[PDB]
Amino acid sequence: APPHDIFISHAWEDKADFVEALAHTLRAAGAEVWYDDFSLRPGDSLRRSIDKGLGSSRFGIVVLSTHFFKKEWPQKELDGLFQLESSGRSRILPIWHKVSKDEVASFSPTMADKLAFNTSTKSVDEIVADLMAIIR
Amino acid sequence: APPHDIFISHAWEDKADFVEALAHTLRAAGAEVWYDDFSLRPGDSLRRSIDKGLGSSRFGIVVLSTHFFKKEWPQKELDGLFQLESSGRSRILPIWHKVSKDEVASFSPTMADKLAFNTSTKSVDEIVADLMAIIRD
């Protein structure tokens, strides 16, 4: 089994005011979490990072915020992040964060049906409760 | 179902240089592209042009440049250029070309905040890879 339950992929701008908070709430709920090496800055490879993550984590969360999209990733990689596993199981769970639907439609990635979380419809506690349900 | 994958809305001044280069690159990558009857001139109806393009194409591209801005389109003419589909995605993909953000805001505030493709941040090839991804995925 992998040494990490979840890794949180995020743009560097979201580390201070959200990711750090989501991680702390998760760790207190019982999940083993790592994210320090998953802050994406301009220049980084998105796929390479995701691979290092699933490489030793059971699941992954990608913070889909405006800063994440502004990093201008390849639409192929982006559209890929959310393809479901041939096992039915979902390994990469997206969390939409402070974005406008109209504002990000040119890059909105093709994902599963009602597979994403949204901090606009749920608080960190609610989402962590759900994620824990998913980790067990 | 649609006989075309992509139509490219653009100001006539950009046909010669940019749009053509882009059209070639896109077709070379496997996209079915039309744009000859999509050059725009002051007065023309961006409105109807978009309807037409969307009536036979899967997606549309609009080149946002100074030339397209200097056409003075009324607000009611820009409105269709934003339409979104159930997927939350738009069938009209904008591409900023040699324009500043302040310049964009001057033309259309809403447009200046909509994330788009930018030839200032990606080569035409990179943009074409993204477009092919969008056509397929």
Query: What is the ordering of alpha helices and beta strands of chain A?
Result: EHEEHEHHEEH
| Share in β-strands of chain A | 15-25%
Largest interface: A-B, 18 and 24 residues
Number of domains of chain A: 1
Q: Give the number of helices of chain A.
A: 5
Taking the sheet with the most strands of chain A, its summary is:
6 strands, parallel
Rg of chain A (C-alpha, Å): 14 Å
Gist?
The structure is a homodimer. Chain A is of the alpha/beta class and 136 residues long. Chain A has helices spanning 15-29, 46-54, 66-69, 75-81, 124-135, and strands at residues 4-11, 33-34, 39-40, 57-64, 92-96, 117-118.
What report would you give on this structure?
The structure is a homodimer. With 136 residues, the first copy, chain A, is of the alpha/beta class. Chain A has a single domain, classed as Toll/interleukin-1 receptor homology (TIR) domain (Rossmann fold), CATH 3.40.50. Chain A is 35% helix and 20% strand. Chain A contains five helices and six strands, in the order E-H-E-E-H-E-H-H-E-E-H. In chain A, strands 1, 2, 3, 4, 5 and 6 form a six-stranded parallel beta sheet that branches. In chain A, helix 1 links the parallel strand 1 and strand 2. Chain A starts with a strand and ends with a helix. Chains A and B meet through helix 4 of A and strand 6 and helix 7 of B.
Provide tags for this entry.
35% helix, homodimer, Rossmann fold, NAD(+) hydrolase PdTIR (chain A), 136 residues, alpha/beta
